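Retro notes, item 3 of 5
We never archived the inputs for the S-adenosyl-L-homocysteine complex last cycle. Fixing that now. Sequence and ligand:
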Amino acid sequence: RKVEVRTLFDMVGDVQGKSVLDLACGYGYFGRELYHRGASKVVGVDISEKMIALAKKKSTEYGDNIEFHVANVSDMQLNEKFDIITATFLFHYAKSIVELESMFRSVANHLKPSGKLVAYMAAPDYQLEKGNCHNYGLNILSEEPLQGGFIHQVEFITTPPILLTFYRWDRETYKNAIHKAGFGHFEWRKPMVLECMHTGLTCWMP
Ligand SMILES: Nc1ncnc2c1ncn2[C@@H]1O[C@H](CSCC[C@H](N)C(=O)O)[C@@H](O)[C@H]1O
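Structure as it came back at the time:
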């Protein structure tokens, strides 16, 4: 998925001298890559004690300067604003519209004026009835309808196979969440390769 990574790095653009906050950072893969492209500062946040422990361990192996915090994005307080916030596969862990809105509000509160959010999530549009994504390597096992989205149980065709639950919020739910948070504008980023897929989201503060 080169164009996914390309779009992701295109969505972020130039990071030279930019402060980056990596939300749902895991062991800090993405923030670390932006550290090597000349980010002035990188901070990582994840809700998992396990992931942040492994992140700090990896930073030791790399001898990098990256700061890691255990926090829920919905109520995190770093007492600092950043040029760029990355939130790849964070928002489909939001179990409610209120939680989704909490997360966007928290992102906005940590953005410098004219700062941008770069996100990637399960396509808001996707409905099971349209067709399953076996070809893409993602098996949709169950669909539970929510007010303004769906709960999807997804099996990734791996060995062993693993089952993930996505809260797939529709475009309108996202638009309202982005609006309430006080973003100036945003757009959906959906690349098309020549010779089911996840969607990018870029949001700019005034
Ligand atoms: N409310 C929340 N706040 C912060 N991190 C969260 C969260 N809910 C889930 N996460 C974290 O989100 C991560 C998703 S997997 C890692 C995603 C990573 N940004 C990437 O693109 O590769 C998990 O590590 C999980 O612990």
